[PDB]
Amino acid sequence: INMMEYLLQGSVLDHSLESLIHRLRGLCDNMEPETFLDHEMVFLLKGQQASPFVLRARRSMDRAGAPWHLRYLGQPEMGDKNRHALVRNCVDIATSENLTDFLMEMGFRMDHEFVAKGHLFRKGIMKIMVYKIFRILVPGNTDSTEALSLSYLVELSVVAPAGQDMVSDDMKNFAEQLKPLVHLEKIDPKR
Amino acid sequence: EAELSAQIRYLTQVATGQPHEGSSYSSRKDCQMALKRVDYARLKLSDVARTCEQMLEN
C-alpha cells in the first residue's frame, strides 16, 4: 500500500532550550534521549520534464552498523481533508553501503550536503526531533563545519497509512501543549 | 509584595496543566529482588553451618 506523512515545524532560540527539553521530558514517554548525529545528501535527476526527480540519502556517523536510508517525498496535497499539517506521500528504503555509486550510475547528481545534530523523543505514534543544522564546505571532508544560525529547529511528525482521520487533531492538541515556548504551524515549502 | 509577584511570574512560565507521567519504579523492583536473593543465601549458609557444627562435635 501507500503511506502518508503529516508534518509540523517550528524553531526555538538556543538560550532557552533547557526549559523546552525539560518540558518534553515531562510530556513524552518514559525513555531516555538518543542524541543522534547524521550526514545527509540530496540527489537530483534532470530529465525531459520540467520538475526534476529528487531523493534524499542519510547516514549515521555515531553508530556503526546502521544501513543507509533513502527517502522520496512527493508534492503536498491540496485536498481539504486535513488542513492543519503538511500531508505528503513518502517512500522510505533501507539500503546497503554502496548507495552513492549506484545512484550516480543511474544518472543522479549531488546538489548539497549538511550535518544535523540534536535530540529525539517519542510519544505514542508521534516523533519529536529537535536539531541544529550545520554547513559543509570543502565537500570531501566532514570536519569543516560551521553553524548556520542562532536557533534550533523543532519537528513533529506522524507517518500512517492513507485515510486515518482524527490524527491532525491529536497533533494540534500536542502542539498546543507547547504553545508558550514554541509556536508550530503548517507552512508550505515555497518561500 | 515584590517577592510574591516575582514568584507568580515564575509560575506563569512553568505551568502546563498535565500530570507528568515519569516515575522510578523499575530500578526499585530490581533492588528489592537483589536484597531477597542475598537473604536466601544467608539462610542456606546458616543451615550448612549448623550441620557442620553438629558433625565436628562427637
Add this chain to the structure above:
Amino acid sequence: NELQRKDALVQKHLTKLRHWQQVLEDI
C-alpha cells in the same frame, strides 16, 4: 590419620563459613 584429615578439613570449612556469614550479614 585420615580421620584427623577429615576433621581438620571440615573445621576449615566451618571457620570460613562463619567468616562469610558475618561478611554477608554486615550488609
Add this chain to the structure above:
Amino acid sequence: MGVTCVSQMPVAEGKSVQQTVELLTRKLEMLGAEKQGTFCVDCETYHTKLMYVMHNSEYPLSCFALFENGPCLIADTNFDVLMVKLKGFFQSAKASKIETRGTRYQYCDFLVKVGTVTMGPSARGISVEVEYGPCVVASDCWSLLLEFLQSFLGSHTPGAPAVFGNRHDAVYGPADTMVQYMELFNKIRKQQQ
C-alpha cells in the same frame, strides 16, 4: 552465504522437460535427499544501459538491483514501489518477464534446487543450483562441490564459475548468485529454440 554453483542441464536430445526433471528428482531421492518446500526466482529489466531487478524466495525480504558490470544493491521489498513512482524515466520493458519454479531438497548440509524456466506460459529450459552451507570462502571447498556434482550428474558437470575469477581471499556473498542467475537467464534468452 555459502558457496553456490548454478548451471543449465540440456534437454537430452528427446522427450520433454517433465521427463528430465522427474529423472533428476528420482536420482536425488534415491541418493537420500528429502523434500523441504518449494522455490521461485524472477527477474525484470528496465531501461530509459540496462538495469535488472530480481527477487528470491530464499531471501523473502530483499530486492536485488544489478548492472551488467557495475555495482549491486540489496534493498528491502519497498524498492519496487519506488520504481512504480518513477514511471517517467524507466520503462518496464514488457515481454521480458521470466521465472524459474521447482522444489528444493536438503541432504546433510547441502541444498539442491532443480527448476524449470518459463517465458511466461511456455517452458524452455532447466536450471540446477547446488549450495554448500558451512564454507564462506569461494573456491576453498570447490573440490567437495565437484565431487557431489559428479555424484548425481555424471556428465554435463560444469566447472569454475566466472564469478570465482577474482583470485583473492574474498568472502563469498549472496549477491554473486544473482550475477550467475542473470548470466544464465541471458544465455537462455539468447539461444531460445
